């Protein structure tokens, strides 16, 4: 003990949160220095300095000491040090930590307010604050347990960690050091501690002294604890040596209790000597978890006391080394050494539940779940632990009542995201929703769909989101009522009416993982399903009900794939730990492991024939391996791939092994000899590198399908010919697929939660499977191909039945639709996502299908009775509804048909395509009027007053044709490039403005020049509308911007346009009242004329909307997102 401090060192250390010396301190200069050395041996270059050793040997104390020396601080870590206490943590654990470390480093919000909402984000937000804002700083990781935790700090920093396992760094790259600390000190130093505690000097130290140290195994933690006794009870020296002698401590699980012995004893004793009043307070600390510094306030409510008092009480404990604590800034928080938490938990075992119940009880006697303001020292403790205690006390009614509440969700998510809660629901499911209710799933699904929204600023009206759930959901009822209980307050909640129809409701949905699901598959008889994800476990459940069957902890790192053997007798799993494992599918007992791959093994499939029993594995190490489960050894190692082997399947006729890799090849090895028979280079891309993934065989084993970037390809196993090439979801990359055994069906997880099954041979999409709003990693058919499963990042696994999914339906449409608001109801005609078009009557299912050669655009004749449509090949057809059959085909159009509309009257059909003519087919007669704009291409058009028609091409030109007399009355050149949209002033028509990459020039039809150029937008206008007379013209920006302008030749009124939109702003529309402006782009969003927006609500699952259909009453809306979901909203009662 002494002084190396410098007031500088002080501040730097107090800032980084570095705990300060113990009650009694004894230098260990020999080691302190050794560490420091390893620290300079870092230089300026990032690295790792590890201090390892048995618990309580002093590792923490040592660390804090190393950075307590100006000489080392300045000129080395000039930027300071940051102490992060971590301990044993799971994914949610580490987030709670990182979140905290982030509230610390960005105290000013130098780079965004709000904490990170997940580990991945957090890691990033940190790699910045550390490589600027805090450059040349030392990070202190205290008590690291798993290697993956360091993998989040592995961002070019200089880190000094403490750990019991000297192997937590085996999973990290970078220069690494080590500094072993002996389990215990030396009799001299040991004696020193006691010497300093009792107040003597080794000389006057009783005989037992040299003998006591021997019992405390030289462990500082233990020694201090005892030295604390001998101090508070100066006579009983030989007495205590005796107690320490015979460890009278009896803990269940007798067995091999290491560090316990000595510690348990010292603890048992010291605690027993606590005054008969503060004795029950310490017992209460048996619910204080390992690695969790508790703020004072917590205990005040626990013990119905007040700040000062509590602190004194707890100060007594700290004085005996029964409790530790450090400054969090004025307010104090107290922790416990991991070893003591174990002591207390073992001792007071049978009271734990009650102690947990005592907490919560005192939390309710003082707070409300959704009331705690973010200024309370204990604010955090409650959010991330209130749920814990309730369940640790096994309180159904209490817990349920907290989780099954939007207020809690809203309150918490807004503070820490939905990450944690999504975990809680899985964890506490058992004690949570049981009975017969599904109120759990409801909230469980609720968090899936909107998880992406919750926590993100601006915090989304939780009531709205809840209104978009099934009527039959608690989430809905809670939100609905939350609404009505406010009826009239300048809000108005839109209410998705056809919410019912949409939602491809899958026959079954399973939630058994706490992290992303990477792969899942059916048992050979299809009765069961096994799924393995990033949560490190192997899971199995009945295919029929999701009824959990097995919950194994398969690996020590993410599980990339899993499969069943030919007789479902086994299940293998291969993971990132580079191991492969075999399990008894019945009992789940490990039936041996095979570690031989260098890198992570991705592929693992068994032989199909019930005869032989082999396992094939592909790995990032470029090899493939055949294992003979009937042998403790590998059987073959196929060398050959140029890159990572991503997939492999045995042929039905077990003689061949197909293999798929990143080296751009498909390959057929010969099982019986592990020899490469063929290799098929994938060269269908325009030298570029391509990765092939999923790759299954045909029924006869004579064909193989594979996926590469945007395509699925069918090869002839023999000739090696490409028998087919279907192009998938435009331009993205197929993440996974699976070929059925019938109907040449193929299911592929397109790109990001999009799932569509195609028909090879027909080379056409058959169905759109909408079920996830988070990445889909895997997907596959049951063995009879009667159904398929979906595995995703939203950590769910859903089972679908093919038949039901492939049936044609109005659940998913294209964005080409037309609506007719006819008072008593709404009517939507839409181009089906696969074949024809649907006559959807909102406010009633009444969906009527009309098949057709895949139309390209729709059209409704006011009065219904007739519907018209565009064609890919240019065809035009009117169908008459009253009959629903007899139609007509008016010849014309080269390119595919774009816009298409009926005349005011039911006769004549104006239509445009991708060329410069506008067909005016006055059907019924057979007459035609052509408008050779001679432009380049008619961008679009729209009917006008009396048989007059406004038209704009992307040549800056806008014309005013006359139907009946294809005569260009007016012709303007209002822009030097594509005219994107433009509307009329409706009222009168004195005005009709444009918008076109640049600004929004507004005019009057007459003056062959614009009234005034509005060069406001920086992104480029894409839409606009005139106030229903009013005197305003709102314009849509290509960058979510949207300025309001005034009908007065040219000005620049208020630019209400945040983003802190969600991509583009493809539409606007003033309200009759000329006060509320409705907007649509990445989502709908209402505003308030003249500064400030409004009901910024309604987030649609999908984005990139186009044209929002408001109605007369401005109390009904219809739209369609790129997810093909039909939104028919309508202001609440």
Extract the annotated binding site for ATP: 53-60, 164
Q: What are the respective helix, strand and coil percentages of the chain, to the nearest 5?
A: 20, 30, 50
Does 95 sit near ligand ADP (CB under 6 A)?
no
Beta-carbon contacts of 719 under 8 Å, excluding residues fewer than 6 positions away, are none
Comparison of 224 and 985: residue with beta carbon closer to ligand ADP: 224
Binding-site residue numbers are 53-60, 164
State in angstroms the smallest separation of the CB of 328 from ligand ADP: 18
Nearest Cα residue to 751 out of 783, 711, 695, 787: 711
Distance CA 879, CA 836 (A): 12
Cβ–Cβ under 8 Å, residues 544 and 527: yes
Q: Which of 17, 58, 466, 890 binds ligand ADP (CB under 6 A)?
A: 58
- Provide, rounded to whole angstroms, the least separation between the CB of residue 336 and ligand ADP: 10
Phi/psi of residue 49, each to 5°? -125, 115
Q: Are 645 and 631 in contact (CB under 8 A)?
A: no
Q: How many CB atoms lie within 10 A of CB 847?
A: 16
Quick one: 313 or 318, whose CB is closer to ligand ADP?
Answer: 318
Contact flag: residue 324 with ligand ADP (CB under 6 A)? yes
Dihedral in degrees, nearest 10, Cα atoms 59, 63, 68, 72: 140
What residues pair up with 1126 in beta bridges, in sequence order?
1120
- The yes or no reply on residue 410 touching ligand ADP (CB under 6 A) is no
Residue nearer to ligand ADP on the CB measure, 224 or 809: 224
What tokens appear for 320 in the block?
């005996």
- DSSP 8-state symbol, 6: -
Residue 441 in 3-state DSSP? Answer: helix
Applying CB under 6 A, what is the total number of residues that bind ligand ADP? 19
Q: Nearest approach, Cβ of 52 to ligand ADP (angstroms)? A: 10
Stretch that binds ligand ADP, among 58-66, 165-173, 593-601, 952-960 (CB under 6 A): 58-66
Number of H helices, E strands in the chain: 26, 62
Taking a C-beta distance cutoff of 8 angstroms, is the pair 1098, 1085 a contact?
yes
Q: Kindly state whether residue 197 participates in binding ligand ADP, applying the rule CB under 6 A.
A: no
Asked if 812 is part of the footprint of ligand ADP (rule: CB under 6 A), the reply reads no
Query: Under the criterion CB under 6 A, does residue 321 sit at the interface with ligand ADP?
Result: yes
Torsion sign over Cα 822, 825, 830, 835: negative
- C-alpha–C-alpha distance, residues 634 and 627, integer Å: 5
- Least separation in angstroms between CB 483 and ligand ADP: 52
3-class secondary-structure state, position 593: strand
**528 contacts ligand ADP (rule: CB under 6 A):** no
60 lies in the binding site for ligand ADP (CB under 6 A): yes
Task: Give the three-state DSSP class for 858.
Answer: strand
**Contact criterion met (CB below 8 Å) for 1066 and 1041:** no
Per-residue binder mask for ligand ADP (CB under 6 A), 1087-1116, x = binder: ------------------------------
What are 668's two structure tokens? 């057929």
Residue 665 interacts with ligand ADP (CB under 6 A): yes or no: no
Angle between helices 220-232 and 187-198 (to 10 degrees): 30
Per-position x/- string for 455-494, each x denoting binding to ligand ADP as judged by CB under 6 A, each - no binding: ----------------------------------------
- The strand order across the sheet containing 866-871 reads 855-860, 866-871, 877-880, 887-889
**353: DSSP letter:** H
Residues in the chain that come right before a backbone break, where C and next N are over 2.5 Å apart: 686, 1060
Q: Looking at beta carbons only, is 230 or 707 nearer to ligand ADP?
A: 230
Q: Which of 24, 355, 393, 1025 binds ligand ADP (CB under 6 A)?
A: 24
Extract the tokens encoding 293.
């510094």
Distance between CA 765 and CA 648 in Å, rounded? 26
Residue 1004: Cβ within 10 Å count: 15
Name the residue nearer to ligand ADP (CB basis): 61 or 841: 61
- List residues bridging with 855 in a β-sheet: 871
Question: Is 341 one of the binding residues for ligand ADP (CB under 6 A)?
Answer: no
C-beta of residue 57 within 8 angstroms of C-beta of residue 164: no
Least distance between ligand ADP and beta carbon 224 (Å): 4
| Contact window for ligand ADP (CB under 6 A) among 22-30, 480-488, 587-595, 881-889 | 22-30
The answer to the question of residue 26 lying near ligand ADP (CB under 6 A) is yes
Q: Closest distance between ligand ADP and the C-beta of residue 334, in Å?
A: 12
Q: State the angle between helix axes of 260-272 and 338-347 in degrees (0 to 180), rounded to the nearest 10.
A: 70
Nearest to 736 by CA among 795, 681, 695, 794: 695
Q: Give the whole-angstrom CA distance, residue 1056 versus residue 1044.
A: 7
Q: Which stretch binds ligand ADP (CB under 6 A): 23-31, 327-335, 671-679, 1086-1094?
A: 23-31
57 binds ligand ADP (CB under 6 A): yes
Pairing of strands 722-727, 711-716: antiparallel
Nearer to ligand ADP, 142 or 577 (CB): 142
Residues between 224 and 283 with contacts to ligand ADP, criterion CB under 6 A: 224
Rounded to 5°, angle at Cα 462 from 459 and 467: 145
**How many angstroms separate the CA atoms of 39 and 67, rounded?**
9
Residue closer to ligand ADP by CB (options 134, 189) is 189
Contact mark string toward ligand ADP, 138..177, x via CB under 6 A: ----------------------------------------
User: Rounded to the nearest whole angstrom, what is the least distance from the CB of residue 223 to ligand ADP in the complex?
Assistant: 7
Distance in Å, CB of 67 to ligand ADP, minimum: 14
Restricted to residues 208-227, the positions that interact with ligand ADP (CB under 6 A) are: 220-221, 224
| Min separation Cβ 80 and ligand ADP, Å | 21
Which contiguous run of DSSP H or E holds residue 82? Answer: strand 81-85
User: Which residue in the set 13, 66, 149, 193 belongs to the binding site for ligand ADP (CB under 6 A)?
Assistant: 193
30: CB partners within 8 A, 6+ apart? none
Least separation in angstroms between CB 324 and ligand ADP: 6
Residue number with CB closer to ligand ADP (25 or 775): 25
* From 18-26, 367-375, 622-630, 1065-1073, span contacting ligand ADP (CB under 6 A): 18-26
Name the token pair of 489: 């307050």
Specify the residue, 321 or 602, whose C-beta has the smaller distance to ligand ADP. 321
Which residue number places its CB atom closest to ligand ADP?
Answer: 59
Q: How far is the CB of 13 from ligand ADP (least distance, A)?
A: 16
CB of 679 to ligand ADP, least distance (A): 55
CB under 6 A: which stretch of 50-58, 451-459, 496-504, 907-915 binds ligand ADP?
Answer: 50-58
Q: Does 56 bind ligand ADP (CB under 6 A)?
A: yes
Compute CA distances 321 → 240, 325, 378, whole Å.
17, 10, 24
Return the residue of 13, 17, 18, 28 that touches ligand ADP, per CB under 6 A: 28
CB of 192 to ligand ADP, least distance (A): 8
Among 13, 61, 101, 839, the residue binding ligand ADP under the rule CB under 6 A is 61
Among 1017, 982, 1005, 1003, which Cα is nearest to 1049's? 1003
Nearer to ligand ADP, 179 or 817 (CB): 179
Tell me how far, at minimum, the Cβ of 122 lies from ligand ADP, in Å. Answer: 24
CA distances from 289 to 64, 335, 352 (A): 22, 8, 12
Cα gap 383→380, rounded to integer Å: 5
Residues engaged in binding ligand ADP (CB under 6 A): 22, 24-26, 28, 55-61, 193, 220-221, 224, 321, 324, 337
């Amino acid at each position: 003990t002494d002084g190396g401090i410098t007031s500088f060192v002080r501040t730097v250390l107090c800032e980084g949160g570095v705990p300060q010396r113990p009650v009694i301190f004894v230098t260990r200069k020999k080691l302190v220095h050794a560490i420091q050395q390893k620290l300079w041996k870092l230089n300026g270059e990032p690295g790792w300095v590890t201090i390892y050793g048995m618990a309580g040997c002093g590792k923490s104390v040592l660390a804090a000491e190393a950075v307590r020396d100006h000489s080392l601080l300045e000129g080395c870590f000039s930027g300071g040090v940051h102490w992060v206490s971590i301990g044993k943590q799971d994914k949610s654990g580490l987030l709670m930590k990182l979140q905290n470390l982030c509230m610390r480093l960005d105290q000013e919000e130098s780079f965004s307010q709000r904490l990170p909402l997940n580990i991945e984000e957090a890691k990033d937000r940190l790699r910045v604050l550390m490589l600027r804002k805090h450059p040349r700083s030392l990070l202190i990781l205290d008590d690291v347990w798993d290697p993956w935790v360091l993998k989040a700090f592995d961002n070019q920093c200089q880190i000094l960690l403490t750990t019991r396992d000297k192997s937590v760094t085996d999973s990290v790259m970078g220069p690494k050091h080590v500094v072993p600390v002996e389990s215990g000190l030396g009799r001299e130093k040991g004696l020193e501690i006691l010497s300093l505690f009792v107040n003597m000097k080794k000389e006057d130290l009783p005989a037992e002294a040299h003998s006591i140290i021997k019992e405390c195994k030289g462990s500082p933690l233990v020694v201090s604890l005892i030295g604390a006794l001998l101090r508070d009870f100066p006579n009983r020296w030989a007495y205590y040596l005796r107690q320490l002698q015979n460890k009278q401590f009896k803990r269940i699980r007798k067995s091999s209790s290491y560090d316990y012995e000595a510690l348990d004893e010292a603890m048992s004793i010291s605690v027993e000597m606590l005054r008969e009043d503060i004795k029950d307070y310490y017992t209460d600390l048996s619910i204080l978890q390992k690695d969790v510094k508790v703020p004072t306030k917590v205990l005040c409510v626990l013990w119905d006391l007040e700040t000062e008092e509590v602190e004194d009480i707890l100060q007594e404990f700290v004085n005996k080394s029964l409790l530790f604590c450090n400054r969090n800034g004025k307010s104090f928080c107290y922790y416990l050494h991991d070893l003591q938490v174990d002591f207390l938990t073992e001792k007071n075992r049978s009271q734990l539940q009650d102690l947990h119940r005592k907490m919560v009880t005192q939390f309710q006697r003082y707070y409300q779940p959704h009331t705690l303001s973010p200024d309370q020292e204990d604010c955090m403790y409650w959010y991330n632990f209130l749920a814990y205690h309730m369940a640790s006390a096994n309180m159904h009614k209490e817990l349920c009542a907290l989780m099954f509440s939007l207020d809690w969700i809203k309150a918490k998510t807004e503070l820490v995201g939905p990450a944690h809660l999504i975990h809680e629901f899985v964890a506490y499911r058992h004690i949570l929703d049981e009975k017969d209710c599904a109120v759990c799933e409801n909230f469980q699904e609720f968090l899936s769909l909107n998880g992406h929204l919750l926590g993100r600023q601006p915090f989304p009206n939780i009531v709205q989101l809840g209104l978009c759930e099934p009527e039959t959901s608690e989430v809905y009822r809670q939100a609905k009522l939350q609404a009505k209980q406010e009826g009239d307050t300048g809000r108005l909640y839109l209410e998705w009416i056809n919410k019912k129809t949409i939602k491809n409701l899958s026959r079954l949905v399973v939630r058994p993982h706490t992290d992303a699901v990477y792969h899942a598959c059916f048992s050979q008889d299809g009765q069961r399903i096994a799924s393995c994800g990033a949560d490190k476990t192997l899971q199995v459940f009945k295919a029929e009900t999701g009824e959990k069957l097995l919950d194994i902890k398969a690996h020590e790192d993410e599980v990339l794939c899993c499969a069943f053997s030919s007789d479902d007798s086994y299940i293998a799993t291969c993971s990132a730990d580079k191991k492969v494992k075999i399990w008894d599918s019945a009992t789940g007992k490990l039936v041996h492991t095979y570690d031989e791959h260098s890198e992570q093994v991705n592929c693992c499939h068994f032989t199909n024939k019930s005869n032989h029993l082999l396992l094939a594995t592909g790995s990032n190490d470029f090899f493939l391996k055949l294992w003979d489960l009937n042998q403790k050894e590998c059987r073959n190692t196929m060398f050959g791939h140029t890159n990572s082997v991503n997939h492999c399947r045995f042929s039905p006729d077990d003689e061949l092994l197909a293999s798929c890799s990143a080296d751009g090849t498909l390959r057929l090895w010969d099982v019986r000899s592990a020899n490469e028979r063929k290799s098929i280079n994938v060269k269908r891309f325009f030298d570029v590198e391509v990765i092939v993934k999923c790759c299954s065989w045909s029924a006869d084993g004579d064909k193989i399908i594979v996926a590469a970037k945007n395509k699925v390809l069918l090869f002839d196993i023999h000739t090696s010919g490409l028998l087919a090439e279907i192009h998938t979801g435009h331009h993205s990359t197929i993440q996974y697929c699976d070929f059925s055994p019938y109907d040449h069906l193929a299911v592929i997880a397109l790109s990001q939660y999009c799932v569509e099954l195609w028909n090879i041979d027909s080379r056409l999409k058959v169905a759109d499977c909408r079920g996830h709003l988070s990445w889909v990693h895997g997907v596959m058919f049951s063995p009879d191909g009667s159904s398929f499963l979906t595995a995703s990042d939203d950590q769910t696994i859903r089972v679908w039945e093919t038949k039901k999914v492939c049936k044609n339906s109005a659940i998913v449409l294209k964005q080409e639709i037309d609506v007719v608001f006819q008072e008593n109801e709404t009517m939507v005609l839409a181009v089906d996502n696969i074949r024809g078009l649907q006559l959807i009557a909102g406010k009633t299912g009444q969906i009527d299908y009309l098949p057709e050669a895949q139309v390209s655009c729709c059209c409704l004749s006011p009065h219904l009775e007739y519907v018209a449509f565009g064609d890919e090949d240019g065809a035009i057809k009117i169908i008459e509804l009253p009959n629903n059959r007899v139609f007509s085909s008016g010849v014309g159009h080269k390119k595919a048909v774009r816009h298409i509309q009926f005349t005011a009257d039911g006769k004549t059909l104006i239509s445009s395509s991708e060329d410069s003519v506008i067909q005016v087919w006055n059907w019924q007669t057979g007459d035609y009027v052509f408008l050779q704009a001679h432009q380049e291409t008619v961008k679009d058009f729209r009917l006008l007053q009396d048989s007059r028609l406004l038209s704009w091409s992307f040549d800056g030109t806008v014309k005013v044709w006359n139907v009946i007399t294809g005569r260009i009355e007016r012709d303007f050149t209002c822009h030097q490039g594509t005219v994107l949209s433009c509307a009329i002033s409706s009222d009168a028509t004195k005005f009709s403005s444009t918008s076109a990459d640049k600004t929004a020039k507004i005019w009057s039809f007459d003056l062959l020049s614009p009234l005034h150029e509005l060069k406001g937008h920086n992104g480029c206008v894409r839409c606009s509308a005139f106030s229903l007379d009013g005197i305003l013209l709102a314009t849509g920006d290509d960058n979510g911007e949207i300025r309001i302008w005034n009908v007065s030749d040219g000005q620049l009124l208020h630019s209400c346009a945040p983003i802190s939109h969600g991509g583009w702003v493809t539409d606007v529309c003033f309200s009759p009242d000329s006060k509320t402006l409705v907007s649509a782009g990445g989502y709908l969003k209402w505003w308030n004329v003249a500064t400030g927006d409004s009901s910024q609500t309604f987030y649609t699952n999908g984005t990139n909307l186009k044209k929002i259909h408001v109605s007369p009453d401005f109390r009904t809306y219809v739209t369609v997102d790129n997810l093909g979901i039909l939104y028919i909203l309508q202001v609440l009662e």
